[PDB]
Amino acid sequence: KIMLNTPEDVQALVSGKLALRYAGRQTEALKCVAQASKNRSLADFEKALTDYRAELRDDPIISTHLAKLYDNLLEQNLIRVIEPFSRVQIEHISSLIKLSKADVERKLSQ
Amino acid sequence: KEQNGDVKEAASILQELQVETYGSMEKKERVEFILEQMRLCLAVKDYIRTQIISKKINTKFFQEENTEKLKLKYYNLMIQLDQHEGSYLSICKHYRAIYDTPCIQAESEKWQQALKSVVLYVILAPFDNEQSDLVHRISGDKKLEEIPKYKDLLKLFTTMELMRWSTLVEDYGMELRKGSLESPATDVFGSTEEGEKRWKDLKNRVVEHNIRIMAKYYTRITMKRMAQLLDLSVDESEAFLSNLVVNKTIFAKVDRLAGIINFQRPKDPNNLLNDWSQKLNSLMSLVNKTTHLIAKEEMIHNLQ
Structure with missing residues (x-):
């Protein structure tokens, strides 16, 4: 349901009292995933990949789907900030996202 | 229950109001009972309940078969909270309808309220179409030139020379000071934050609007020089460019090397x-x- 990009229903299904007794350390990571998605934030999603990789290390094969969600929000970032810019500094435009130019250069050039 | 302090029954009366406005044909009592919708809603302050109710409020109503003379006072009581809860476009279609409020009543205080708010909605008119034709709906009034702010309308009209807003500082300041006309400027600054949002949004709106005017010209005013003539920082000009990328500057040229831009x-x-x-x-x-x-x-x- 977050792969169809509705974090409000994620808030709704952590808001219903039936499945809320089954909340735990698993779904807090999902609340940070949905939180970074509803923020449209990228480094915060990397913090969800940082603190919760100890429940995202036991994450299934759908980690690739989560990574494609991350990279797709990265794609929307790239087609957001580059799109007005004919020619721009790489650190002026990565200073927005405060990330290194290495992986960004690899994904862009890819 | 209003003086009881118990506004829990607001959901009861407004939930029964939908039932008590559908299923019958009432012209007179329905307009009298539609004030209950926004009556307790000031105590409730619910955006989603306002979304339920101008929607069911103004569904079918234009003018006729409905007087209390005090119709228009309630029209003022309608979309004021939609300016509260919405932002700026909400009065574009609202204060364009208070032109007959001078035709109904004494016009002396309509200078102060009606002819004050006769300019703000076309300030907040969107730049695409409604700005272009809706300025002629106020143009032609002989009471328009009697306003001192008529020249401020004409400065917002077209072909804006990049002008200093410190010249507008004394205009808005004495526009607060004089009670001769447009007395609710202190009501424009009525809320602690809202008039500040109107003001930063106002300077913002004109400082984007004039860029859309000089953006017609290919004359290349070379925005590094323009940021020096504007006496403002280039970082909030990058913020201005964040308003331009959502304002569709998407056909333009920027420079990694220079800071000079090209719109063509x-x-x-x-x-x-x-x-x-x-x-x-x-x-x-x-x-x-x-x-x-x-x-x-x-x-x-x-x-x-």
């Missing part, structure tokens, strides 16, 4: 663009060359 100089297809320029230039030279040729050839006939 596309890829320029010669089968499209220089095609088009060569077409209308050549053809207009030919046929404009054609007309006064034979016309002056008829003018020399009369000298004989």
